[PDB]
Amino acid sequence: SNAMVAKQLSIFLENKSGRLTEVTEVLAKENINLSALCIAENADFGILRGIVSDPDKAYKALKDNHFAVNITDVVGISCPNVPGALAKVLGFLSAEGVFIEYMYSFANNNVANVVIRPSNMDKCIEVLKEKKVDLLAASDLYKL
Amino acid sequence: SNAMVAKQLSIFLENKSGRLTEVTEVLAKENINLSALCIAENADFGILRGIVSDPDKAYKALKDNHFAVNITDVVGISCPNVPGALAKVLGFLSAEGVFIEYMYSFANNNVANVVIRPSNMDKCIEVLKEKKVDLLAASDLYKL
Amino acid sequence: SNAMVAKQLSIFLENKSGRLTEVTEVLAKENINLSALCIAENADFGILRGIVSDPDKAYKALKDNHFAVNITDVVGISCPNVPGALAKVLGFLSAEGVFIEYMYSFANNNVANVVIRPSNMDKCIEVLKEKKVDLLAASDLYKL
Amino acid sequence: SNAMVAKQLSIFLENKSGRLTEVTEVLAKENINLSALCIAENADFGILRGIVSDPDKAYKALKDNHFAVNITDVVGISCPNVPGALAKVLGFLSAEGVFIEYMYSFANNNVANVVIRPSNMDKCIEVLKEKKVDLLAASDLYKL
Ligand SMILES: N[C@@H](Cc1c[nH]c[nH+]1)C(=O)O
Ligand SMILES: N[C@@H](Cc1c[nH]c[nH+]1)C(=O)O
Ligand SMILES: N[C@@H](Cc1c[nH]c[nH+]1)C(=O)O
Ligand SMILES: N[C@@H](Cc1c[nH]c[nH+]1)C(=O)O
């Protein structure tokens, strides 16, 4: 293992109309909880990016139901739910030449949970640990 | 007003490297809290989609700092943080021909907060109220 | 349905060094020509949007090779390859409130060929016929 | 920098009925020709990616009209308009581990012209020179 590196599902949603409901139905039937998701969409289709409670079980269920799914490495962090808090993290990263390809995040009461897909995963984790950023274990992320 | 309809900022992040840190710095300086965000990215640029604590103040600060920003109507909902919970909502919508253009969401302890951009905003809100889905007031969404 | 409407292939490229090559090798092995293509991408993977010489045959060959492939209706038009030619077409559409979701075009010597995916195909086609834009037959788009 | 590399305009289209028309009218009013274009879109707005006859002049005119416009390096190539021609180019790149972020191409009678944005321009150009692919000078891409 790699510890703080989490598996994100990327799921190709064809049609529009449709398939997103069936995907959430596949996952419900397996008692797989969704922790975090974000759709990256275009005019015709979406891609569901997804943090789930059991990514390997979820992946095989989806393939079995004929979905196109890929797994991507991402890292979860927690910071205070106050103005400028995320700003401080991103400034640590950018000062070290580590850039965000995408991220998604919500405030959760007093903190905020952030999923990141960094330009360089080894370097990103290095900086964050160095700057004493709360990283989430992949397993913490899967049980939000 | 329109009540449950919230303002989402969409912010054009040029470069890659960069500009996301400056945007979060603009917002920090105004003591504007981020509630929820999601980047919809391509190979060159991103678009930061953003739920903030004061969208009008945030919008004018960003324009003042020469960002390209647009506001979009979205609706926030809350459901249980259990398997199939989101599934039930989406099935209500799709049974009524209301489809999701995009959404993003995180589990927040015992519930989950979901931001939706529906195919039809008037119809989406109608179905959800009818099916007794917890909608979030726009103001609830801005203070997560 | 509509007259003139052509089948665009949308192929999930699961990424980023062929998979894409593999698509093009599957089509070449079938003696299927690419007339036009463009990739709509995010940070992790792309969607190849393609006009090909036989879309049903390409579909089958790509499905046989386990690609996720969808079909989308699009419309081909021609206009003079001169400044202002395309602008003149776009103004017909935008004055009748016809939105463009996406399009792709290249100058081809004396004409430009443009593939359009409008928000409403019915209204799009009506306005183009009415304003006498040169619509392509699907089979003319396929033989480029 | 590299030899052969051309300037692609990436224009924020803030949406979805011109704004796009307005871009094309700004360029036509400057007597600037579009050689190639494609829109990379999401549900709310698009990004127009364009090759034009004078990219610095188009940039200035679009900035003068308050568009958010960025410049990206891309590379133009030609290949025979026959099945397998493009596949042959893509296999050179993918065998040397060169990833394609996006590309767009149309068959132009006897050749196809392809605009490529690779993940690493240096390595891309090296492999194309070496394997003798027909690279376009920027000024040849601009005069299509
Ligand atoms: N509310 C915090 C943390 C946050 C980021 N995203 C969501 N919440 C901020 O403004 O940085
Ligand atoms: N955990 C819940 C709700 C949820 C949706 N997105 C994030 N959480 C489910 O599986 O539906
Ligand atoms: N070159 C023509 C038409 C065109 C659009 N795209 C490619 N060509 C113009 O500038 O209007
Ligand atoms: N038509 C050629 C080259 C091409 C790519 N795109 C447009 N044309 C092929 O099938 O390889």
d(CA D100, CA A9): 22
Residues in a beta bridge with D103 = D116
How many whole angstroms from its chain centre is CA B41?
16
Q: What residue numbers bound the domain in which A32 lies?
A: 1-144
Closest Cα partner for D104 from D37, D47, D54?
D37
d(CA A99, CA B21): 10
d(CA B86, CA B128): 12
Q: Which of C45, C63, C124 to mutate to test the interface with A (most CBs of A within 10 A)?
A: C45
Listed in sequence order, the residues at least 6 apart from B94 whose beta carbon sits closer than 8 Å to its beta carbon are A17, A18, A21
User: CA-based angle A14:A16:A18, to the nearest 5?
Assistant: 90
d(CA C123, CA C127): 6
Residue in chain B nearest C16 by alpha carbon? B43
A79 HSE (CA, 13 A, CB side): 22
C4 HSE (CA, 13 A, CB side): 18
Mapped onto helix, strand or coil, the DSSP state of residue A109 is: coil
Residue with tokens 């079909």: C71
Closest ligand (CA of B51)? 1
Q: What radius of gyration do chain C's Cα atoms show? A: 16
> Is C25 in contact with D87 (Cβ distance < 8 A)?
yes
User: CA-based angle D21:D25:D30, to the nearest 5?
Assistant: 155
> Is D18 in contact with C91 (Cβ distance < 8 A)?
yes
d(CA C99, CA D113): 28
**Number of neighbouring beta carbons within 10 Å of residue D19:** 18
Distance from the CA of C30 to the center of ligand 2, in angstroms?
44
Listed in sequence order, the residues at least 6 apart from A125 whose beta carbon sits closer than 8 Å to its beta carbon are A4, A5, A75, A135
Mapping DSSP onto H, E and C, the string for chain D reads: CCCCCEEEEEEEECCCCCCHHHHHHHHHHCCCCEEEEEEEECCCCEEEEEEECCHHHHHHHHHHCCCCEEEEEEEEEEEECCCCHHHHHHHHHHHCCCCEEEEEEEEECCEEEEEEEECCHHHHHHHHHHCCCEECCHHHHHCC
Q: Where are the beta strands (DSSP E) in chain C?
A: 6-13, 34-41, 46-52, 69-80, 100-108, 111-118, 134-135
B14 HSE (CA, 13 A, CB side): 14
> What residues in D contact A40, CB-CB < 8 Å?
42
What's the total number of domains in chain D? 1
d(CA B116, CA B105): 9
d(CA C53, CA B48): 38
CATH number of D36's domain: 3.30.2130.10
Mapping DSSP onto H, E and C, the string for A8-74 reads: EEEEEECCCCCHHHHHHHHHHHCCCCEEEEEEEECCCCEEEEEEECCHHHHHHHHHHCCCEEEEEEE
User: CA-based angle A50:A52:A58, to the nearest 5?
Assistant: 95
**Number of neighbouring beta carbons within 10 Å of residue D131:** 14
> Is C42 in contact with A44 (Cβ distance < 8 A)?
no
Sign of CA dihedral A39, A42, A43, A48: negative
How many whole angstroms from its chain centre is CA B51?
5
d(CA A74, CA B17): 18
d(CA B69, CA B58): 10
Contact A21, B91 (CB under 8 A): yes
Q: Which of D20, D42, D44, D119 to mutate to test the interface with A (most CBs of A within 10 A)?
A: D42
d(CA C49, CA D120): 23
Residue type, C143: K
CB A85 near ligand 1, within 6 Å: yes
Residue D107 structure tokens: 């068959």
> What residues in C contact A70, CB-CB < 8 Å?
14-15, 44-45
Q: Which of A41, A48, A101 to mutate to test the interface with D (most CBs of D within 10 A)?
A: A41
Largest CA distance in chain B: 45
Closest Cα partner for B139 from B49, B7, B17, B34?
B7
Closest Cα partner for A125 from A14, A1, A5?
A5
Residues in a beta bridge with D63 = none
Residues of chain A with a CB closer than 8 angstroms to some CB in chain D: 40-43
Closest ligand (CA of D31)? 3
Distance from the CA of B33 to the center of ligand 1, in angstroms?
6
- Burial group, residue D109, by CB count within 10 angstroms (0-12, 13-18, 19+): exposed
Which conformational region is residue D132 in: left (phi greater than 0), alpha (psi within -120 to 50 degrees), or beta? left
Count residue pairs from B and D with Cβ separation < 8 A.
38
How many whole angstroms from its chain centre is CA D33?
14
Contact C99, C118 (CB under 8 A): yes
Mapped onto helix, strand or coil, the DSSP state of residue C95 is: helix
- Type and span of the H or E element at C126: helix C121-130
> Is A70 in contact with C14 (Cβ distance < 8 A)?
yes
Pairing of strands C134-135, B5-13: unpaired
d(CA B83, CA C120): 36
Closest ligand (CA of D113)? 4
Closest Cα partner for C89 from C52, C53, C122, C129?
C129
CB-nearest to A40 from C42, C68, C117 is C42
CB A116 near ligand 1, within 6 Å: no
d(CA D11, CA D55): 12
Ligand 1 pocket check: which of B11, B21, B34, B53 to mutate, most ligand atoms within 8 Å of Cβ? B34
